[PDB]
RNA sequence: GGGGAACUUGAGUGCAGAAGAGGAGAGUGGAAUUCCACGUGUAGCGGUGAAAUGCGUAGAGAUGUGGAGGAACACCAGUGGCGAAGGCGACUCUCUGGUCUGUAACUGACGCUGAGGAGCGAAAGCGUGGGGAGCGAACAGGAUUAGAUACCCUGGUAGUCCACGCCGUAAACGAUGAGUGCUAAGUGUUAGGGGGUUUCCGCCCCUUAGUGCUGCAGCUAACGCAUUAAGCACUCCGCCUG
């Protein structure tokens, strides 16, 4: 139920910030769903965009 | 981007702050027409943009007809300078 | 308004580092672009192997251009035998 | 650049030709022509050793630069010309120093662009580099085997080869027909695709046009007589009762390899 | 030859067992068909369990103690063989559920009821 | 109806934002399937309700490497979003279409519909040239059967893919034409805007536009629809008469 981005009041991802992307991907590398992250619907799509970009850039593994 | 729009409206300005005045509008419509036409030549198959082009040219057409019925003088003085038949 | 990221493989002598980054910045500025800021990361264990390197060198080139220089950049980057990956983003 | 003749007479019933918009001029540069008289399949002693040949339209040879030896001098290209020796079309490119040369016109070449040939040339269409500088996975044409000999291997219209990787003194390159080959890394090839890609789709309508090109008629072996071909003879139209179909000189001529099996080059071919 | 890796496929018709070295070098292998199961009985957990201890017996005489197991595919042999290993006296240090899960891969074969 | 003079709600323009698998072109990347060479490796592997054809001592399958290629973009993913419809999901960039919100600065009825006409229009299919991993009509073999030209198993050509043309059909479905106005509520959810406590979070109240689910009156032959009407009405088109 808790919505991390609107709770801490932060704007768009700024994809370089690789620290929280770990918290938002599973240890397996699977991107966590809304049912567990509790984030807002509008922000989730730009999330998976950011994770996909950094994944292509090899900051996050495709599978761990 | 948007600078040609300002150029066109400012140079076709009839009333000091007119942005309706369909003689002004049809200028922007013609600009969009030929710009999207050069885009179509480089992408033949963009049928959705083709649909947008059809919509916008139809809009320009009925605007022209309305201006014709409103006054022939303004029509003629615009069509001759814009060169379209 | 493009923020370019790219990687240069770890086994570069620090002599040739400055050469390669400097010539890339030369390409950007010569193709009409202007650098709004440069910035680096250095080492980081890659999330996965790419060719044979476990780690790599990470560099950032924050640039504002007319969107023609970066295509030439992409060509030069992919055709250089030493850079591994790179992308361009149109920052809004 | 392919056009159809509407069938007016009966000869043009099935016809296609290539309009020459890719070409930019009609008259060649006098300096680079050389004489050429057609041999018509006759050996030095006068005997005939190549059937189905001779009698075309007379043509004049234009010496092409297959070597690309001149390195470092910026080359400007201003022409695209027709050349009736090989399918491809050529470009007369003039250098900064002031001597001109002919080059196989590659696909996507236009008048006015620049040319470089050094071992550090930028990689575009028309440049030539020793293969060691060439990067993997880049289309290339006009390859050679012995360095300095000049391109031999990919020269016809629309023909191309792909580099599958460098591994040492040699290189792996995928020629046309896909039979990948091992080639020395010190050889110079021309980057790009040969620029007459539509040449295959020609539909020569008339027999007379093939004769203009200089191809004599070919008679089937079956309608020959027994003494002059292994198929000839037999009453009526006979099927060939000779197990394997055979050639005019005795060998079989369907589905069997012919290259002397001990040759040295084989060890490079077999990479495949 | 002290450490190794035991790989077992858990299919719906069979269960293979193979052991290898950390360098990916095989030592010995077994299977339901290797033991003598020919029909659908190869898919039973019992067949895979038997496979487990024959693999262990082929493993001990070369002197390997510690293992960790990779399981492939879904099947009834998932639970049988893994605990059959430690029943055979060996020590398996990790369980890895590695199966080929393509993102899209190739289009799968047609349905079974058309 | 015609003509003249108004006016701004309808319809547009400008101004500030917002969203999106909207479209076309170029390039890029990850897990796999297959094939190939290589190391290790013994005796079967594969498959179904049992089986069999197949592949294996010419060393399979398995398992650890390295290549080669072509197809689709896992979770995110949601009766979510966009598009007029077909349809559209990996990433980046180039070009480009439409929509909504708040405005009130502009024009002042410029609007709706639309026979013929024009363009799009899934999949199969056709023509030319490439490409071909997997799947797979046809076809072969093995099973089942009294028979099995099928259901099942092992292969596998055409196709499936790409570029340009052609065909113009689908249960192309919400089996509900387009536009406009009015007629109880409750409840989710998508993109917003305003306000009340703070310009913290997040609590609530209004508010447009979508997109679902229940449910009055009303309609319905019954199902059921019910502000996303199949209700109350007006224009325009198409279609029906065992």
| CB neighbour class for D112 (10 Å; exposed up to 12, middle 13-18, buried from 19) | exposed
Q: How far apart are CA C73 and CA C68, in angstroms?
A: 9
| Residue B20 backbone phi and psi in degrees, to 5 | -85, -120
Q: How far apart are CA C24 and CA E112, in angstroms?
A: 58
Whether D171 contacts D184, CB under 8 Å: yes
Closest CA to C27 of C11, C14, C86: C86
Residue B56 parent element (H or E): helix B47-70
Length of chain B measured in residues? 85
| Residue D146 backbone phi and psi in degrees, to 5 | -90, 120
Question: Helix, strand, or coil here: E70?
Answer: strand
- C1'-nearest nucleotide to the CA of A48: F76
Whether D129 contacts D60, CB under 8 Å: no
Those residues with Cβ within 8 angstroms of residue E33's Cβ, 6 or more apart along the chain or in another chain = E14, E42
Those residues with Cβ within 8 angstroms of residue D135's Cβ, 6 or more apart along the chain or in another chain = C79, C81, D123, D163
Our measurement of CA B47 to C1' F85, in angstroms, reads 13
Whether B55 contacts B18, CB under 8 Å: no
CB atoms within 10 A of CB E43: 20
| Residue D25 backbone phi and psi in degrees, to 5 | -145, 170
Beta strands in D122-199 (DSSP E): 128-130, 139-141, 161-166, 170-174, 181-184, 188-191
CA-angle at A39, arms to A38 and A43, nearest 5°: 160
Q: What residues of C are in the D interface, CB distance below 8 Å?
A: 79, 81
Closest CA to A5 of A33, A61, A44: A44
Scanning every residue of chain C, which has its alpha carbon at the shortest distance from the alpha carbon of A14?
A: C91
B83 touches strand F (CB under 7 A): no
Query: Which tokens hold the place of B41?
Result: 């030549």
| CB neighbour class for D143 (10 Å; exposed up to 12, middle 13-18, buried from 19) | buried
Return the DSSP state at E44: S
Query: Which tokens hold the place of A30?
Result: 């699977």
Whether D118 contacts D70, CB under 8 Å: no
Mutation target for A interface from C37, C46, C47, C85: give the one with most A CBs within 10 A.
C47
Q: How far apart are CA E88 and CA E49, in angstroms?
A: 10
Query: Which tokens hold the place of A2?
Result: 């808790």
Q: Which residues on A lie below 8 Å from C47 (Cβ)?
A: 55, 58-62
Closest CA to D27 of D74, D62, D67, D65: D62
Query: Do chains A and C touch by CB distance (3+ pairs < 8 Å)?
Result: yes
DSSP conformation letters of A10-26: --S--TT--HHHHHHB-
User: Facing residues of D191 across strands?
Assistant: D140
CA-angle at D53, arms to D228 and D160, nearest 5°: 120
Those residues with Cβ within 8 angstroms of residue D193's Cβ, 6 or more apart along the chain or in another chain = D106, D107, D108, D125, D139, D141, D158, D159, D160
Our measurement of CA E114 to C1' F147, in angstroms, reads 22
Q: How far apart are CA D109 and CA D95, in angstroms?
A: 16
Query: Which D-chain residues 91-130 have CB contacts (< 8 A) with chain C?
Result: 123
Nearest-neighbour CA in chain D from C79: distance (Å): 7
Whether D161 contacts D175, CB under 8 Å: yes
A38 touches strand F (CB under 7 A): no
Return the DSSP state at D214: T
Query: Which tokens hold the place of E75?
Result: 């099947």
Tell the residue number behind the tokens 């040939």, with chain if given: D117
Query: Which tokens hold the place of D261?
Result: 């099996």
A46 touches strand F (CB under 7 A): yes
Q: How far apart are CA A38 and CA A57, in angstroms?
A: 26
User: Facing residues of D254 across strands?
Assistant: none
Check the CA dihedral C50-C52-C58-C63 and report its sign. negative
Closest CA to E69 of A28, E11, E80, E57: E80
Residue E27 parent element (H or E): strand E26-31
Taking each continuous run of H as one helix and of E as one strand, the counts in chain D are: 2, 14
Beta strands in D72-152 (DSSP E): 75-77, 90-95, 100-104, 114-115, 128-130, 139-141
Beta strands in E48-105 (DSSP E): 66-72, 91-96
- C1'-nearest nucleotide to the CA of C65: F93
B31 touches strand F (CB under 7 A): no
Query: Which tokens hold the place of E9?
Result: 């496929």
Check the CA dihedral B37-B38-B39-B44 and report its sign. positive
Those residues with Cβ within 8 angstroms of residue E3's Cβ, 6 or more apart along the chain or in another chain = E21, E22, E64, E65, E66, E67
Would the CB atoms of C7 and A56 count as touching at under 8 Å?
no
Chain F positions within 7 A of any protein Cβ atom are 11-15, 19-25, 27-33, 39-52, 60-65, 67-78, 80, 83-86, 90-98, 105-111, 119-121, 128-131, 133-137, 151-153, 164-165, 189-192, 200-202
Q: How far apart are CA D147 and CA D130, in angstroms?
A: 9
Residue E10 parent element (H or E): strand E5-10
Whether D22 contacts D89, CB under 8 Å: yes
Q: Which residues on C lie below 8 Å from A62 (Cβ)?
A: 47-48
Those residues with Cβ within 8 angstroms of residue D262's Cβ, 6 or more apart along the chain or in another chain = none
Q: How far apart are CA D249 and CA D229, in angstroms?
A: 7
Q: How far apart are CA A62 and CA D44, in angstroms?
A: 69
Mutation target for D interface from C74, C81, C82: give the one with most D CBs within 10 A.
C81
Q: At what angle do helices B22-42 and B3-12 cross, to 10 degrees?
A: 150
Those residues with Cβ within 8 angstroms of residue E31's Cβ, 6 or more apart along the chain or in another chain = E14, E15, E16, E17, E42, E51
CA-angle at D6, arms to D3 and D10, nearest 5°: 125
Closest CA to E74 of E20, E22, E10: E10
Question: Helix, strand, or coil here: A9?
Answer: coil
CA-angle at D220, arms to D216 and D222, nearest 5°: 160
Query: Which tokens hold the place of B12?
Result: 């076709």
Q: Which chains touch B (3 or more CB pairs under 8 A)?
A: none
Query: Which tokens hold the place of E53?
Result: 């201890």
Experimental technique? cryo-EM
Length of chain A measured in residues? 64
| Residue D181 backbone phi and psi in degrees, to 5 | -130, 150
Nearest-neighbour CA in chain C from D135: distance (Å): 7
Whether A5 contacts A23, CB under 8 Å: no
End-to-end CA distance of chain D: 36
Q: How far apart are CA D207 and CA D213, in angstroms?
A: 10
Chain-centroid distance of CA D158 in Å reads 9
Q: How far apart are CA D231 and CA D49, in angstroms?
A: 20
E7 touches strand F (CB under 7 A): yes
Q: How far apart are CA C89 and CA C31, in angstroms?
A: 18
| CB neighbour class for D86 (10 Å; exposed up to 12, middle 13-18, buried from 19) | middle
Q: Which residues on A lie below 8 Å from C5 (Cβ)?
A: 57
Length of chain D measured in residues? 272
Whether D144 contacts D185, CB under 8 Å: no
| Residue D2 backbone phi and psi in degrees, to 5 | -135, 130
């Amino acid at each position: 139920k808790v919505c991390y981005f609107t709770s801490n009041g932060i704007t768009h991802i700024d994809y370089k910030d690789v620290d929280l992307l770990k918290k938002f991907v599973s240890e397996r590398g699977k991107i966590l769903p809304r049912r567990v992250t509790g984030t807002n619907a509008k922000y989730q799509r730009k999330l998976t965009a950011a994770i996909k970009r950094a994944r292509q850039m090899a900051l996050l593994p495709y599978v761990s | 981007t948007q600078e040609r729009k300002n150029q066109l409206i400012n140079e076709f300005k009839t009333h000091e702050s007119d942005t309706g005045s369909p003689e002004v509008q049809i200028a922007i419509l013609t600009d969009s027409i030929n710009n999207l036409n050069e885009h179509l030549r480089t992408h033949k198959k963009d049928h959705h943009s083709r649909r947008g082009l059809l919509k916008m040219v139809g809009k320009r057409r009925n605007l022209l007809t309305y201006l014709r019925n409103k006054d022939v003088t303004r029509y003629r003085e615009l069509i001759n300078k814009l060169g379209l038949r | 308004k493009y923020e370019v990221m790219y990687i240069i493989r770890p086994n570069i002598d620090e002599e040739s580092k400055k050469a390669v980054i400097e010539r890339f910045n030369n390409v950007l500025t010569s193709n009409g672009a202007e650098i709004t800021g440069t910035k680096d990361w250095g080492k980081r264990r890659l999330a996965y192997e790419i060719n044979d390197f476990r780690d790599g060198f990470y560099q950032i080139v924050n640039v504002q251009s007319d969107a023609a220089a970066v295509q030439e950049f992409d060509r030069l980057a992919k055709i250089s035998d030493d850079i591994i990956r790179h992308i361009v983003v149109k920052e809004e | 650049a392919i056009k159809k003749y509407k069938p007016t007479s009966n000869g043009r019933r099935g016809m296609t030709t290539s309009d020459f918009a890719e070409i930019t001029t009609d008259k060649p540069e006098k300096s680079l022509l050389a004489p050429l008289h057609k041999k018509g399949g006759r050996n030095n002693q006068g005997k005939l050793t190549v059937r189905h040949q001779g009698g075309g339209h007379k043509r004049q040879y234009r010496v092409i630069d297959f070597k690309r030896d001149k390195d470092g001098i910026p080359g400007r290209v201003a022409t695209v010309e027709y050349d009736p020796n090989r399918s491809a079309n050529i470009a007369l490119i003039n250098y900064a120093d002031g001597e001109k040369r002919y080059i196989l016109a590659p696909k996507g070449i236009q008048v006015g662009t620049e040319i470089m040939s050094g071992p550090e040339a930028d990689i575009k269409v028309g440049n030539a580099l020793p293969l060691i500088n060439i990067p993997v996975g880049t289309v290339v044409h006009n390859i050679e085997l012995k360095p300095g000999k000049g391109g031999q291997l990919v020269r016809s219209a629309g023909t191309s080869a792909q580099v599958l990787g460098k591994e040492g003194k040699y290189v792996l390159v995928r020629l046309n027909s896909g039979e990948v080959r091992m080639i020395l890394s010190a050889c110079r090839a021309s980057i790009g695709q040969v620029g007459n890609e539509q040449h295959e789709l020609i539909n020569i309508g008339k027999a007379g046009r093939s004769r203009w090109k200089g191809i004599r008629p070919t008679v089937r072996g079956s309608v020959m007589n027994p003494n002059d071909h292994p198929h000839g003879g037999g009453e009526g139209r006979a099927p060939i009762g000779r197990k394997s179909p055979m050639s005019p000189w005795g060998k079989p001529t369907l589905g069997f390899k012919t290259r002397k099996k001990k040759n040295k080059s084989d060890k490079f071919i077999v990479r495949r | 030859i002290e450490s190794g890796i035991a790989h077992i496929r858990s299919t719906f018709n069979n269960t293979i067992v193979t052991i290898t070295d950390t360098h990916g070098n095989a030592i010995s292998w077994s299977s339901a068909g290797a033991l003598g199961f020919r029909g659908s009985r190869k898919s039973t957990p019992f067949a895979a369990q038997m496979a487990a201890e024959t693999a262990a017996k082929g493993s001990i005489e070369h002197g390997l103690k510690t293992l960790e197991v990779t399981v492939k595919g879904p099947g009834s042999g998932r639970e049988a063989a893994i605990r059959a290993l430690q029943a055979a006296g060996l020590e398996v240090t990790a369980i890895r559920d590695v199966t080929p899960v393509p993102h899209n891969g190739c289009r799968p074969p047609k349905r079974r009821r058309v």
